[PDB]
Amino acid sequence: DLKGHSVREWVSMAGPRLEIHHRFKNFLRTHVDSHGHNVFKERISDMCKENRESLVVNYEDLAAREHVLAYFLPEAPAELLQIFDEAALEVVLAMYPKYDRITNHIHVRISHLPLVEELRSLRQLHLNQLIRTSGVVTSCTGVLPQLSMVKYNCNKCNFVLGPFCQSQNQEVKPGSCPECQSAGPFEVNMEETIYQNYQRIRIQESPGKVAAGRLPRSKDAILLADLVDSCKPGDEIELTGIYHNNYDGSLNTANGFPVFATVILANHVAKKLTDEDVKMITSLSKDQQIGEKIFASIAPSIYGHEDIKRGLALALFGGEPKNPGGKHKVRGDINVLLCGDPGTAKSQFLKYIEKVSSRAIFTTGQGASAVGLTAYVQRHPVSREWTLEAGALVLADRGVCLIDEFDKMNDQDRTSIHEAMEQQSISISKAGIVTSLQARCTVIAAANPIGGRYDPSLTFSENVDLTEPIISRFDILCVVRDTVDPVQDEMLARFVVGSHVRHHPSNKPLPQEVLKKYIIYAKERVHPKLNQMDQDKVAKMYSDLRKESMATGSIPITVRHIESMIRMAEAHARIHLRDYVIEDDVNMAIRVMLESFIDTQKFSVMRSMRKTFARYLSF
């Protein structure tokens, strides 16, 4: 019921405390379901099955069945939340009385609060009220331990001053010891205390929602005991919490308006491997067109460059790493370099790889890089803790670093990427950190040739500004020429304009994550083995290719290329999800490796090799 006094004082009175606690118990037990299920029974069943420590309830259901509580909720949320903690504790103990050891506490979260305010507009009129809001996490410190029921050693006599509850507002302070009667220098008993997880995030208004002439505004937020690490930086998150002012934040200091900071005790944060995967992946792997389906599922937002779609497929699935003895580093990573004249989807390719492949990061030879190739240690600014920011490769240790504009990286990045793909370990020796972080990168890269146009007369090495050892070890070199042509340009223009009209704001092969599950399955679980290839055929293949390449200015095919051939064979076997490499796979790996080698070779020699080796490129 209602009276002249305020809502908060009302709900503070004991009579209505029992009233609303009874009402919460009542609808917890009785609000069966939309369609007669008693959903609270099943929710509590799962809650205690995992020991989640936290229930969540829908505000629409709350208000619809019992509306007085819903109206009271934003007015004096703290008191209602405490009582619902107690009532939920009662009902969960009723369902499972064995729960008593489990945390002695249940939190309750409220979802779908109808009235969302915007971080631009949170005024005095929302203090001490439960609001709903949206934003992006700009920072999120680590999980810290907070006092929740603290016991103090009176260090005059070592009496254990009993467990004081710790509100978020002001630090608890014992008056005196019940034994020796001193307000002594008390100090926390580290053990008998039962702490509580504390994490501090900072959300800000999303640029997609910020207005024209503006700076997005940022509100702090505190996560406690179950929601810590429920959201990482850059996550678009809805936040529901008690917008809050009265803790100790106030500019009572000199030189300041009497102006208060604010926080949000977050009461609900909402962001915005498997089984049967073997079944689906193997069932489609039966099809045996799966190689071309993968080749046509890789990079659908690009036209042409089928050679590079295939090549990046082989780079994505990789080979296998081996070490005969503890003496020979032979690698499973297939490194790729697109070299292309401008405006030919190099960065488009790279961003597709970043989107699709797990443990992918992006980096640029220029200084605009999100993540850097070098490794450095400093005090990271948004956290101000002294990190070892290990570079881009190490951060992409398993999967892919993607080096866009590979042809302009500063000489330090040249040194670092060379030493990465050569050693496969990045050797840091800056402050006192003389270590070697292993970097099993699978580098993809893009490079614009000299003069902004590919020059078929000169060779690849001398018309791209990447020095010989760097250009060598890349398992695939691909050339991208923007050759003017009627039908090609017609097709490209029609595709682009179709995308544009489709992407007007009025209109608002295998799927990509299907391919991603395929990627991890065939990258870790499946290791095709090789005793089933015409060893003599490939040995004579190297013989014939190098024998033709014997000439001046004709740096020949070598063992680098023959091991790259085996890597590509394994990769195609992986791609076929087989457990044994087959002559078909060996033929395809031969085809792609030889295509890469001839197109590396300049025009006249390219035509000689193409004419005399068309039998393999025929397949």
Partner DNA sequence: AAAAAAAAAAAAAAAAAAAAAAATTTTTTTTTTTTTTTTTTTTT
Partner DNA sequence: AAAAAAAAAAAAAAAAAAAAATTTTTTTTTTTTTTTTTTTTTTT
Q: Which 408-437 residues touch DNA, going by CB under 7 A?
A: 410
Minimum gap (Å) between residue 479 Cβ and ligand ATP: 13
| Interface residue with Zn ion, options 154, 225, 269, 409 (CB under 5 A) | 154
Binding-residue pattern over the window 152 to 191 for DNA, x denoting contact by CB under 7 A: ----x----------------x-------xxxxxx-----
Q: What residue 379 binds from Zn ion, ligand ATP, DNA, none (CB within 5 to 8 A, per partner kind)? A: DNA
Minimum gap (Å) between residue 347 Cβ and ligand ATP: 4
Give DSSP secondary structure letters for 12-50. Answer: HSHHHHHHHHHHHHHHHHH---TTS--HHHHHHHHHHHH
Establish whether 347 is an annotated binding residue.
Answer: yes
3-state secondary structure 264-303: EEEEEEEECCCCCHHHHHHHHHCCCCHHHHHHHHCCCCCC
Q: Do residues 73 and 80 make contact, with C-beta atoms less than 8 angstroms apart?
A: yes
Binding-residue pattern over the window 366 to 405 for DNA, x denoting contact by CB under 7 A: ------------xx-x--x---------------------
Establish whether 199 is an annotated binding residue.
Answer: no
- Of 22, 264, 13, 259, the C-alpha closest to 137 is 264
Cα 575 from chain centre: 25
Q: What residue 348 binds from Zn ion, Mg ion, ligand ATP, none (CB within 5 to 8 A, per partner kind)? A: ligand ATP
- Of 340, 407, 410, 341, the C-alpha closest to 373 is 410
Q: What residue 346 binds from DNA, Zn ion, ligand ATP, none (CB within 5 to 8 A, per partner kind)? A: ligand ATP
Minimum gap (Å) between residue 111 Cβ and DNA: 35
- Measured from the CB atom, the residue of 302 and 510 that comes closer to ligand ATP is 302
| Interface residue with Mg ion, options 146, 245, 347, 435 (CB under 5 A) | 347
| Interface residue with Zn ion, options 33, 179, 489, 583 (CB under 5 A) | 179
As to burial, measured by CB atoms within 10 angstroms (0-12 exposed, 13-18 middle, 19+ buried), residue 22 is exposed
| Interface residue with Zn ion, options 27, 159, 164, 616 (CB under 5 A) | 159
Minimum gap (Å) between residue 183 Cβ and Zn ion: 10
Query: Which among 22-30, 343-351, 540-548, 561-569 is the span making contact with Mg ion, rule CB under 5 A?
Result: 343-351
Number of Cβ within 10 Å of residue 365's Cβ equals 21
Q: Do residues 473 and 441 make contact, with C-beta atoms less than 8 angstroms apart?
A: no
Minimum gap (Å) between residue 161 Cβ and Zn ion: 8
CB burial readout 317-350, b (16+ within 10 A) else e: bbbbeeeeeeeeeebbbbbbbbbbbeebbbbebb
157 touching Zn ion, by CB under 5 A: yes
| SS3 category, 525 | helix
C-alpha 110/C-alpha 268 separation (Å) is: 7
Minimum gap (Å) between residue 341 Cβ and ligand ATP: 7
Q: Do residues 164 and 189 make contact, with C-beta atoms less than 8 angstroms apart?
A: no
C-alpha 541/C-alpha 586 separation (Å) is: 12
- Measured from the CB atom, the residue of 154 and 592 that comes closer to DNA is 154
- Of 416, 317, 315, the C-alpha closest to 363 is 416
Enumerate the H helices of 100-157 as residue ranges. none
Q: Which 476-495 residues touch DNA, going by CB under 7 A?
A: none
All residues at 6 or more sequence positions from 6 whose CB lies less than 8 Å from its CB, including other chains = none
Cα 398 to Cα 304, 328, 604: the distances in Å are 29, 20, 40
Give residue 242's identity as a one-letter amino acid code. Answer: I
* Chain position whose Cβ is nearest to ligand ATP: 346
Minimum gap (Å) between residue 301 Cβ and ligand ATP: 7
- Measured from the CB atom, the residue of 69 and 177 that comes closer to DNA is 177
- Measured from the CB atom, the residue of 411 and 468 that comes closer to DNA is 411
Minimum gap (Å) between residue 603 Cβ and ligand ATP: 22
346 touching Mg ion, by CB under 5 A: yes
For residue 137, which phi and psi values (nearest 5 degrees)?
A: -75, 115
The binding site for ligand ATP (CB under 6 A) comprises: 302-304, 340, 342-348, 448, 492, 496
Report CA Rg, the chain: 32
180 touching Zn ion, by CB under 5 A: yes
Minimum gap (Å) between residue 409 Cβ and ligand ATP: 14
C-alpha 398/C-alpha 321 separation (Å) is: 12
What is the contact surface with Mg ion in residues (CB under 5 A)? 346-347
Q: Which residues bind DNA (CB under 7 A)?
A: 156, 173, 181-186, 378-379, 381, 384, 410
- Feature table: binding site for ADP: 347-348
- Binding residues, as ranges, are 347-348
